[PDB]
Amino acid sequence: QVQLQQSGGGLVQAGGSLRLSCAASGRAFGYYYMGWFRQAPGKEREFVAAISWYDGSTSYADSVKGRFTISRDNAKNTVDLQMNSLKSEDTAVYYCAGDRSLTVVASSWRYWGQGTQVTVSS
Amino acid sequence: QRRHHTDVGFIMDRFVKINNTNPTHVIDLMQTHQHGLVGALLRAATYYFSDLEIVVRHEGNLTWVPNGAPEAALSNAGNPTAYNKAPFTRLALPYTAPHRVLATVYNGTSKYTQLPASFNFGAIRATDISELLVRMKRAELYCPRPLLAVEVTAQDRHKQKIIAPAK
Amino acid sequence: QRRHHTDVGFIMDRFVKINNTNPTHVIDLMQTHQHGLVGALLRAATYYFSDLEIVVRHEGNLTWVPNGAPEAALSNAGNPTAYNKAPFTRLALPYTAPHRVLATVYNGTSKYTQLPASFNFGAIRATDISELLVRMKRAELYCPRPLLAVEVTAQDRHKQKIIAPAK
Amino acid sequence: ETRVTQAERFFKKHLFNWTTDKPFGHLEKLKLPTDHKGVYGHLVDSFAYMRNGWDVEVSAVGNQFNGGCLLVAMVPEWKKFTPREKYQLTLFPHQFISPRTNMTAHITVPYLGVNRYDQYKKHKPWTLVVMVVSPLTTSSIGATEIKVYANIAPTHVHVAGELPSKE
Amino acid sequence: GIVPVACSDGYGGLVTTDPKTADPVYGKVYNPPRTNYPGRFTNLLDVAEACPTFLCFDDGKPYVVTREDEQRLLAKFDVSLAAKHMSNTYLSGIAQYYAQYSGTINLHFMFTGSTDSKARYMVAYVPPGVETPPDTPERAAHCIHAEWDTGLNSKFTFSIPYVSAADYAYTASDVAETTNVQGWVCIYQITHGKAQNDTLVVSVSAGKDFELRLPIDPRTQ
Amino acid sequence: GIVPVACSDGYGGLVTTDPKTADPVYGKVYNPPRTNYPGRFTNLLDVAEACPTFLC
Amino acid sequence: GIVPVACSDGYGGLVTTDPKTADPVYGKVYNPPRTNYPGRFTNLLDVAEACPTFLC
C-alpha cells in the first residue's frame, strides 16, 4: 500500500525557513508525480508545488513562485519542500500527495498523506 | 541403507533417443517414448526444469535458433551454426523458455490434449537429420503423479526372463 | 535487472560471412551485409576499433601483407605464409592502420559515397578462396547513429512466425 | 604545435527562413568551418594541419503568439538523411527551440576524427543541422515569418606545420 | 614415457560462436591508444534510455492534431515494439534483433501549441483484458490512467507498466494470437480552448529497468 | 618444444551414460529462479514411503 | 583412466612465423663463447642514427 508520512511541521517566525519531509513506502514511488497541497483554515486544498520523476523539472503556484523549493530523493524515497521567505498567509496544513497525474485539482490524486501543521507567526 | 540409484537427478542423466526426426525439428522433451525409463519417469511429474545436451547426425551445417525466434531465422548463419565433423556433433543448450518451469499436463488453452507451443527448447535445421539424442542435465521435478507398471492379464504376476549364465 | 545480452563487446564477438571473395582480397569490415546483426549494429556507429580473426577455405598457401605494403609483396613467401591443412585455416590478425580509429562514414575526400582506401586490415591471397569469415575481438564503438527497423506497409506491426513445438 | 588565441572569436550569420508553408522534415545544413573572413581563414589557407572544437548559439527571433518547435543539432561526419531516420536526430547533441518556451540554444563540441590533425580544405567533421519538428502555426496576431541566426566560434585552436605566404 | 590421451568423438568442430581464441601470426604490434575519445557507448540500452525518439502517427507525422468533432478520442496506438506507430523508433530498431524482453517503457508528451491556448487531457493504458478498449473517455478512468494540464508545464512523462502472464514477453508478435496482443494507449481531450491546429508531439524511450535477452539474426539475407 | 601424447586404442567412443560434459554453444543465459516451489521431490523412494496405495 | 582431448579444426598448420620451437635431434653441444667481440649491434636504427651517409 502506497503510504505517505509527513514530518517537519511546527511553529516558525515570519520571514524564516522551514523544511517538510514526505517519507513514502511502496513499489511505485519511481513512477508517481509527487507534489504538495496546502489547506488553509476554512479553505479547500490548493496546489502549491510539484516535482517530476524523470528529468526533475519544477512547478510552483503563482502565490509561492520564487520563494519555495521542492526536491526529491529517489534513493531514500523521500520528497522535501524547502520553504523560505515566510508570510502569514502560509499558515495551513500541508499534505503530501502523489499519482501519475500532474494537475492543480486535488480530487485527481488518489493517494494522500496524513498532513502536517505549519503555523506562521507574524 | 544406500538410496543413490533412485535419485531424481541421477536417473535422468542419460541419453535417450527421440524417434521423430525431420529436416526442421522443434526440440520438445515430450517426444520421448512414454514407456521407457526416462519417458515414464518424466510423465510421473507435473512440472520440470532442465538443461540439455544433444547428439545429432546430420549432413551439412546445423543451425540453432532459441525459443521465440521466428521460423525464417533458420536460414541465416548468424545464429549459432555448427560445421559437421565425421561421426556426429555434440552441443550443450541452455533453458530459454519464458516460463519459470515447464509442464507435462495443461488444463485448458492459452490462445484468446495439447500443450502450448511455448513449451520447447528451440529448433534445429540441417539438409537432413538421421538421428537425435537428448540428455537432461541438473533435472528437477515437482508435484508427483501416478506411475503405472505393466498389467497382468490372468497370471499371478508378470514374468520376464532374466540374464543367466546357462550354457 | 540483467543487461548482459545488449553489451557492445559481447554482441560483436561472433563469426559473420563476407559475401565477396576474390583470389586477392582486401579485408575491410564494410563488406559485411548491411541488414545482418553485426552489419547493422556496426553501421550504427561512427568510429570503431577492433582486432580480427578469420577462417579461410583455400587451395595452396595463404599470404598476408599488412596495411600499407605494396601489392607486389603478395608474391613473396617472406610475408607470413600459412600452409593449408584439411578443413580450413584459423588466423589472428592485429590492427595495423595508421589512424587511431577507423570510420564508417567520411565527409569528403583525402587525395590532393566512398571511404579512403587506408581503412583496411591488410590483404590475403591464394590460388583461390571459397569462403571467408571474420570476427571482431575487443570491439569498441563511438558516436552513435540512427538504427532503423523493418518498415510496416499497411499493417499495425511486423509479423514474423516464431518457432513453435506444434506437431 | 602552438595554440592561436586570436582565431577564437564569434561571427554571426544566416541559417534559413522560417515561414508557415514548411512542414515537418524541412532540413537545412551548414558544414563547418565555413568561409570565415578573419584570422581563421588565414590559418585555413596559410596553415595546413589544424584541430579545434566549436560552439554555436542559435536564436529564433519572434513572439509567444506563434506555435512550433525547432530542432538544432551537431551531426559528426554528416551524410544525407532519408526521411525515415529524421525521426532519430536526437541521438546527436541537440537542443529544442520553440518560441513558446525557449529562445537560445547552446551546443559545444570537441575535436574528433581519424587523424590527430585535419585539413579543412578537404574534410569537414561537424555540421549545423536545423529541422522543423512541428509546423509554424500563426494567426492574425502572430508574426508571419521568423529569422534565425547563428553565432559561431572555434575553441582550442591548435596548428602544426606553419606554411609560407603566397605573395 | 609420454602422456596417453583419448580423442573424443563429436568434439572439435567449428561453431560460429565458440569461446576459444586462435593462434597469432604477427606479434609485437603496439597500436596508438584511443583514450579520452568523446562519445563512447558500451551498452545499447543505455543509448536507448538516454535519448527519446519520435513516434509516427497517421499520414506520416510525429504530432497529433486537435480534432473538432464529437469523438473525444484523439487517437489510440498499440504498445508493442512491432506496432505500426513505433516503426520509426530506435527502441524498435534495437528490439528487432532479440527474442524476449521485460521492463517498463516511458512516454513523453510535449506541447508545441501556442501559449494563448489552454487545454486538459488524460492518458489511459489498457492491459490485455476486456475485449474492447474503453473508447469512452470516462470508461478509461477505471484503467491505470493519468491527468495532465498544460498550465504548469509543457512537458509530461507517463510510464507504461509491464503486465503479462510469464516473466518475459515476446518481442516478435506472432502470426497467430489475434485480438489485441497486449496493450494499447489512447489519449483523451477533456477540454480545449482555441486549439484547432495546436500540436502535440509524442516520443518514446526505454524505461529504467528495461532489458532484452536473446540475440538472434532474423532478417532475410 | 611441444608436449608428446599417445593416442590410445579403444578409448574415445561415445557411450550413452559417459560422465563427461559437452562444449557450450550459447553463453550468458540467466534463467529466473525456481525457488520456493511447493512439492519438490528428489528421491522416488521418499514418495513411495510417504503415501500408500491400494491393493487390487 | 586417461585424459580426454578434442582435436580442434583449423589449428595445427605450419605458419612461416609461428612462435613455437622444434624438437632437438643432437644434444650436449657446447660452443666456444663469442664474448668481448668488438662491433656488436643489436638494433638497426642505432647504427642508422650513429653514422650519417652522403646524399646523391
PDB file of C-alpha atoms in Angstrom, chain C residues 58 81-91, chain E residues 12 20-24, chain F residues 2, chain G residues 6-16 18-21:
ATOM      1  CA  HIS C  58      41.648 -22.021 -49.714  1.00  0.00           C
ATOM      2  CA  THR C  81      52.574 -17.730 -45.256  1.00  0.00           C
ATOM      3  CA  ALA C  82      50.162 -20.373 -43.958  1.00  0.00           C
ATOM      4  CA  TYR C  83      50.345 -23.910 -45.330  1.00  0.00           C
ATOM      5  CA  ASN C  84      46.948 -25.462 -45.949  1.00  0.00           C
ATOM      6  CA  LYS C  85      45.548 -28.169 -43.687  1.00  0.00           C
ATOM      7  CA  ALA C  86      42.486 -30.259 -44.479  1.00  0.00           C
ATOM      8  CA  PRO C  87      39.346 -28.313 -43.405  1.00  0.00           C
ATOM      9  CA  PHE C  88      40.417 -24.638 -43.265  1.00  0.00           C
ATOM     10  CA  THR C  89      42.779 -22.146 -41.609  1.00  0.00           C
ATOM     11  CA  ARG C  90      42.293 -20.007 -38.482  1.00  0.00           C
ATOM     12  CA  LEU C  91      44.479 -16.911 -38.063  1.00  0.00           C
TER      13      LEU C  91
ATOM     14  CA  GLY E  12      36.470 -30.421 -32.122  1.00  0.00           C
ATOM     15  CA  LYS E  20      38.157 -20.268 -27.858  1.00  0.00           C
ATOM     16  CA  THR E  21      40.766 -17.997 -29.426  1.00  0.00           C
ATOM     17  CA  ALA E  22      43.035 -18.527 -32.432  1.00  0.00           C
ATOM     18  CA  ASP E  23      46.797 -18.735 -32.851  1.00  0.00           C
ATOM     19  CA  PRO E  24      48.568 -15.418 -33.578  1.00  0.00           C
TER      20      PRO E  24
ATOM     21  CA  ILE F   2      55.637 -29.215 -27.632  1.00  0.00           C
TER      22      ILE F   2
ATOM     23  CA  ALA G   6      39.413 -32.618 -28.548  1.00  0.00           C
ATOM     24  CA  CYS G   7      41.265 -32.228 -31.853  1.00  0.00           C
ATOM     25  CA  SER G   8      40.291 -28.713 -32.909  1.00  0.00           C
ATOM     26  CA  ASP G   9      39.586 -27.923 -36.559  1.00  0.00           C
ATOM     27  CA  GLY G  10      41.737 -25.290 -38.239  1.00  0.00           C
ATOM     28  CA  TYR G  11      44.694 -25.358 -35.833  1.00  0.00           C
ATOM     29  CA  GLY G  12      47.985 -27.176 -36.251  1.00  0.00           C
ATOM     30  CA  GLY G  13      49.143 -25.914 -39.638  1.00  0.00           C
ATOM     31  CA  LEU G  14      52.617 -24.571 -40.328  1.00  0.00           C
ATOM     32  CA  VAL G  15      52.963 -20.777 -40.449  1.00  0.00           C
ATOM     33  CA  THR G  16      56.261 -19.226 -41.552  1.00  0.00           C
ATOM     34  CA  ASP G  18      54.839 -19.161 -35.704  1.00  0.00           C
ATOM     35  CA  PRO G  19      56.461 -18.737 -32.262  1.00  0.00           C
ATOM     36  CA  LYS G  20      56.764 -22.424 -31.306  1.00  0.00           C
ATOM     37  CA  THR G  21      60.091 -24.251 -31.257  1.00  0.00           C
TER      38      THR G  21
END
